[PDB]
Ligand binder design. Structure first.
Ligand code: TCI
Ligand code: TCI
Ligand code: TCI
Ligand code: TCI
Ligand code: TCI
Ligand code: NAG
Ligand code: NAG
Ligand code: NAG
Ligand code: NAG
Ligand code: NAG
Lengths: 359, 359, 359, 359, 359
């Protein structure tokens, strides 16, 4: 038998196969199993609130026509150039921007057909998909991103989309993300769509992402702790009669505010307050407080000198000097201890909220 | 009856149905009801003066042809591949940039036809639409964005566009915007278009947006208030013989001007003066004023020392020192009180103008 | 009469109408009147040296064929789907980048035909057009932007382009630009094109733009004047024995140079010197001069002390101190007066050059 | 013989050549040799993690049909306009984004055919290819970038891809990269692909890149070393009673932290710590340490003065002053020596790790 | 004679003209003269290493067919819609990225045909072309940019490309570049291409660009010279007992390093050292040297005071003070003179290297 003659008899002019009619017309809905392979994951960005993904869609359905039973083999690998003369199902993504095809040297496509009529359609597509991430806890967080596949033009009574029982979602070996660690959970559930026009089938796939705390810690946490230590430098040593202490204080407050403004740059604007904001605010409160500590001790010294200029003057000199020294030594010991207790409280509470949230 | 034979008899070669002629030719204008669904709203940006929206256009009209009365059911769900062999109406958007289609695995389209001839056309389109926002009050404002649908090629005597009486505009459940809160008002009115060529139908849809005052307050209002307090630090304590006071003043003025320049960065250039500009200008006036307060007290002290070098000298020492101290204490108490009264006046006036404007 | 039969008899197979031949072949040139409507104007940018415009091109010409005289009405509104079976004229823009079409739900097009044969062609097109703006006077300037329409493939002997006698250029009501004010002058003149291949027709349209001095004044003029006043603060008060005066001077010079560098950021690089550069340079000269004033008075005081250490020493003390005070008071009064006279001279000369230029 | 008659007899309607059937159908797999030429290499960027390349793909295979043996010459240079009427093989790139074609004046294509049936297909394509670079050692590193060619639609039993024995990869003469030096090694190996659908052929090409240490050294290494020397300036000279030393220290720490933040700007965020981070951290530790050295000597001097105010006081004056001077001189000599030993250790260890890694 | 009948007889179905066969088949190579017109030149950018150009390609060749000799005129201006039914030659650009066509209202094309058979093909194309500029001398340099036209699919034995003897390259009148001055030299030479597949014709056009030294001088040279003068301010006046001198020095070094980092921003990273780097490095060396001058004089004064505290002490006071003053006055006179001699040497050497290079 020649291949050309059979190939046109199956889906051509002698065949009454019209490509505009669904199989099992006036009949039970056409069931479709969908298997997705993820070639690459990338560009998870915040301002845009979307990511880039390259998938290998694969959908199988049955047709009562296209049952040959004439060649002795089970399946046939056809050309991808007659994929316009058969009944492809409609499928689109709901949270989709763009999503072009690929045509390098040939259009990337695959066609297979078995003896009973079960077909196999494979398409390569790069999708930009919108993920509405919640930045309640910015440095430490888990983000869930949604992929939705749904039928634009058919109702529930036709083209019901079902998932695949085994190996529904696969991932390429040795696939990594610079910022996030992918979680091998991939829970699958389906939610139908209701509209005024009708009821439309849909299926959903969920991915869990855990952010890496490697970059943020060095970029932000480590410098701020140093600047606090540097602010602490003044108290321990520099004598009361010091012009420089004030300059040191002003510079360390300026650098604190400019660094705090710099940190919240990439992040999109949000009404709620992030964890990094809380940490930076507390740090700014500490440095500012130090410059107030000097302000206090200098005013007490001024009172001491004013009374000294006016023995009776000697009577208050010792007590005022002792009070100033008392303020200094107490500041010295107290400021690190409270920073320490705040730090342990902050870390433990975030370490416990994340543990509860991940479950 | 076979489906193919009926399908070609309705709109094919045996049918005298020419797709270039409007229904009811030489007759009353073809009425068209338009229903819009909003799948996503996003990217409301200022410099570009435009936003991004993904809609589901739906338009229904009647045809005297395409009345079958042969199948026993009421409606038929046709393929979206013969949407080029019928009379689609022309429709374009006036404030439109771009507005591509979507073709993922199939072109997103929907066709329905009833027994009488009422058709249903559904198209998915992402529109970049230009909104001429007015930034009279930058932190607190309400923005109205306009969507216009109008007929390019037909006059009033044909293809009159009407809105839908019930459920004219729907929004997807759980749809949120990071910066703005959408208002569920959506007032609909239509304005016709007059040109030298002719008179053309149009319909308009209006959306109201309220900006969130969560990001701006932390980013700008909170640091400026701190810097003012820091400027105030000098007066209360540092003695008259102080080199540092001047350095503190210069730094706090530098940081004020650089922060003020930084704030007006994203915003597009406009001739009129925004509210944020007024607040920053007043704050800069306050900090600058402080450095003048020192300038005054130092000059008075200089006069005191000059006369002291020239008892007769003692006669003016007490009065000049008392005057310098008087200036200091008065500055101390007066500066916070006036800031407070300015702040309450500013907040109350903006809170009342917004209340009047929203109505 | 049926509409289809007439519609194909006019421009179809029974008609000898070949769409590849110009009307009046071997005859006088085909005259074409061109009317342009401006729907939107936007994105006037400097670095790119181009702007964005959305027009409604309209061109009318006469044909001896397509004269029906069979329907009782004067004109017919045809479909925009047979605009490929007639003789559209060629037209392109010379200073053009991009210039795509618009195809939303239908291609935006319009066809009309009268009894004598006068046709009406309307096309919507967004053009990016290059404007070679001259920044001789950057804050205050008038920019002229050119639109050119010319024939690529025909010589003078054919397809002569003429403007429209009445209402040649119209603008949409309530159309505004954020940065510029459009001038309602729109002078129209045409310049022919000469090439080695031949002589080609062209027509030109000119638009006048006046920049708004609302943003620049607050952004640049107002802060610099403040910083000059702040520089002046040192002279009036701070005594000769001052460490801080020098620090104040250095900071105000640093902030001046960084602000001057910041101002010339958006503007494209040009060889010639802009007005804003002149103003900033003079301001920098003033602040720098002040720090020199201190340098002078401090050196004179040093000479006074050196002689004092070496009565005979008392003999020169009074004269040197008086000279230092003389320098101080004279600096105090002279510096504002010269700034004032420079400012009035600068403003008056620019206000008069603009008045001469606009004419 | 006329050329047209032969040209249509070979691949036209009289020929039974169907372009949908692979040569040697129901037979051994079609072997394909692939030769690649690299016209340009460019845009190696880090954030995107991809590069741009312009290749000249060339693939040869044999066909039993298309064996003419009628013209007296060996080969024929055909038009590139009938490349749609023959059996092109499918080929796509796995780590591919974009990859458009080129159609300037004509589509860039080449067709050749020999007497036996060996064809030659040449295509020009610009590929954006993703390279997962590892930044373990940022200034000094070797990056390997992968190009993969694989068959989308055929299994192992068909269309086996083989490399070319001689001159498999060529490069254009005088081709240079601004940042990297290309290595003339280009090791070629092939890895097959396994999927649930089937087993698919693939071939891989590897390129080695060595970064230039010319820009980084001047941009980052040279300024930091200067700033350390500048920090060292205080110790050698400025006396114990110095207000300025503290200001110098604070400024040199501020500039160090801002420069360190600035350096890690272009680089994409990564969890692991880069070499440049280690160097900057050590440098910041050194400058910060100096400001502590002053803090220590000032506190010792304070103790000396406090006891002096309270002979018995003279008894401890000499020892405390000697201790302060001892601390100063020792700091003077010790700080450069340790910097030197750290620097030599760092350079030698990186120079040896790179030598081991390149092998 | 009717125009349609002749038009189809020349290149239609009755004509044996196959558009897939080159003229003079089995014959001498088809000679082609190429004339290029440059409508616009723009966007010469450094990071991308490419520029944008809009040309009017024009190529003429002879055909033995298409020789009518039936109309009484010499040439005919045909429609640009049958440019697909003739033998256009292949032509592509080797250093090409992108290069789209233009289709505004009509595709921009031109066809002419003479009595003998000489045709004229004109195409408008915007080309992004890669220029490998060498930044050995960054502020003053001459850049040569290459345009290459070559045949993709034919060998030397066919389609030989020749230049035009007269007026090979023309430029539009009044065409200017903001940054560069175009040189009216445009030397033309051709270099053939050798490949393993075969030998392919090519022709090359060279353009010379001279950079304007108007922007760079004001942006970089002028501020640095001012900052050096400002650094010099300290030496002449401020007495030895000065806290401020050190602060002035540190600020002027900080501003120098930040300005130096800022200057090398737009420029792409390169291993070799640019002229601007040399100038900035020398300037930084001068300012840094000044702060060392103070360090020296302060240490000498410290030795003087230390011996004074320990007449015998008076014996060394005069000599140490005289030495300190000697260092001051000598610094005063020497520093400007050496700057002057360096400046004249630098300018003269660059002015002479450019003169040699341009030849
Ligand atoms: C009796 C004299 C004690 C005054 C010295 C004093 C001053 C001071 O600012 C602080 C002190 C103690 O310790 C405590 C009270 C824990 C504060 C925690 C929070 C803040 C911002 C700073 C701490
Ligand atoms: C009798 C000595 C009083 C002079 C001290 C004085 C100085 C001064 O700058 C201010 C004072 C009072 O209070 C008032 C007058 C409310 C001002 C409001 C606006 C500004 C910028 C600052 C305030
Ligand atoms: C007799 C002592 C007078 C020297 C004080 C003196 C210093 C000085 O720098 C200036 C003075 C006067 O007024 C004039 C001369 C108008 C200058 C105009 C331009 C510049 C930059 C500053 C002004
Ligand atoms: C007996 C008095 C000696 C104290 C002076 C002293 C202070 C000091 O900070 C350093 C000294 C010595 O040398 C060594 C110990 C090598 C340190 C290496 C690492 C660091 C950050 C700095 C060095
Ligand atoms: C005898 C005392 C002389 C020392 C004063 C001295 C210090 C000094 O730093 C320089 C002096 C002279 O002149 C020369 C030697 C020309 C140097 C040229 C290059 C540099 C960076 C600065 C210059
Ligand atoms: C799809 O599956 C459902 C549930 O098993 C079944 O009721 C229906 O008939 C199936 N559709 C077919 C066989 O077309
Ligand atoms: C559209 O509605 C108007 C108002 O009801 C009516 O006058 C007109 O005839 C309608 N057009 C039709 C029925 O084609
Ligand atoms: C166009 O107008 C000119 C000037 O009125 C006239 O000479 C010419 O004949 C006209 N072209 C026609 C009528 O085709
Ligand atoms: C391809 O090469 C293999 C190994 O030499 C051979 O077994 C196979 O038959 C070849 N395929 C052909 C000749 O079609
Ligand atoms: C092209 O020119 C060369 C040199 O004059 C000549 O030898 C060749 O025959 C020409 N090609 C033709 C006439 O086809």
């Amino acid at each position: 038998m020649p291949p050309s003659e059979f190939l046109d008899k199956l889906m051509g002019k002698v065949s009454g196969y019209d490509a505009r009619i669904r199989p099992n017309f006036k009949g039970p809905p056409v069931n479709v199993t969908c298997n997705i392979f993820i070639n690459s994951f990338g560009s998870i960005a915040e301002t845009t609130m979307d990511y880039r993904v390259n998938i290998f869609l694969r959908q199988q359905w049955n047709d009562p026509r296209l049952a040959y039973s004439e060649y002795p083999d089970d399946s046939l690998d056809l050309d991808p150039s007659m994929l316009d003369s058969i009944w492809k199902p409609d499928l689109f993504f709901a949270n989709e921007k763009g999503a072009n095809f690929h045509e390098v040297t040939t259009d990337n496509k695959l066609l297979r057909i078995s003896k009973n009529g079960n077909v196999l359609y494979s398409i390569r597509i790069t999708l930009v998909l919108a993920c509405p991430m919640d930045l309640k806890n910015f440095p430490m967080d888990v983000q869930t991103c949604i992929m939705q596949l749904e039928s634009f033009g058919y109702t529930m009574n036709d083209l019901i989309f079902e998932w695949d029982e085994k190996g529904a979602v696969q991932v390429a070996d040795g696939l990594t993300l610079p910022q996030f660690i992918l979680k091998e959970e991939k829970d699958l559930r389906y939610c139908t769509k209701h509209y005024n026009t009708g009821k439309f089938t849909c299926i959903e796939a969920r991915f869990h992402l855990e952010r890496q705390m490697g970059y943020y810690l060095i970029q932000m946490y480590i410098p701020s702790l140093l600047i606090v230590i540097l602010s602490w430098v003044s108290f321990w040593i520099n004598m009361d009669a010091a012009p420089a202490r004030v300059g040191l204080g002003i510079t360390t407050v300026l650098t604190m505010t400019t660094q705090s403004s710099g940190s919240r740059a990439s992040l999109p604007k949000v009404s709620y307050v992030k964890a990094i904001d809380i940490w930076m605010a507390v740090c700014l409160l500490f440095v500012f407080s130090a410059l107030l500590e000097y302000a206090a001790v200098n005013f007490i010294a001024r009172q001491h000198k004013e009374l000294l200029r006016f023995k009776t003057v000697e009577e208050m000199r010792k007590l005022f000097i002792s009070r100033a020294k008392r303020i200094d030594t107490v500041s010295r010991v107290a400021f690190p201890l409270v920073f320490l207790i705040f730090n342990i409280f902050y870390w433990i509470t975030y370490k416990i909220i994340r543990s509860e949230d991940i479950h």
